[PDB]
Each structure stands twice: as C-alpha cells, then as structure tokens.
Amino acid sequence: GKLQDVVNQNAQALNTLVKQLSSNFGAISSVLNDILSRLDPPEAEVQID
C-alpha cells in the first residue's frame, strides 16, 4: 500500500491537468479553434489572453 499510493497520487495529478483543458476561464469558448474561426485578431486577442 505504500507503493500503490505513490502511483495513485501521480495519476490523479496528471488527470487533473488534462481536465483543465476544458475550462474557458472567462472566455467565450474553451476551444481555441472556435475562437479563431469566429473573431478577427483585434478581439480574438482578448479571448486568447
């Protein structure tokens, strides 16, 4: 159980990093290609930042 706990803690942290790619953090979308196909680079720069 001391060896399995190290494997469980590293797998839980890499899973958290992958799921953070579906937050928009206040932008209009979390997909970067949906921002670039709907806006021109003056106001697409506000959502990408």
């Binding site: 196909s37 709907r38 806006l39 021109d40 697409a44």
Partner: protein, 49 residues
C-alpha cells in the same frame, strides 16, 4: 430563416445602414460558418433607442 446559402457580404458592404454591429462573431468571418438556425426580427423605432 432556414436551409439557405446566404451571402452576408452583400449586406454590410452597402451604404444603406448606419449601424451594423455583430456580437459573438466578427463580420469578416460570417462567410465561413454554418449557423444551424437563423431568426430575423423586424420593427421600426425612433433614433435614440
């Protein structure tokens, strides 16, 4: 409005309109997007409102 092939570049490139304001999209990009659903709402108001 449904199942069209629209051409938005005929609209904004004419000097009829004193207001052409798109909100979630930029007007340059409108000729590239399939829109799923379009509604068209019309009325007459005063100049200030």
């Amino acid at each position: 409005i449904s199942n069209c092939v629209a051409d938005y570049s005929v609209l904004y490139n004419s000097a009829s309109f004193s207001t052409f304001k798109c909100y979630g999209v930029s007007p340059t990009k409108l000729n590239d997007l399939c829109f799923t659903n379009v509604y068209a709402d019309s009325f007459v108001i005063r100049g200030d409102e």
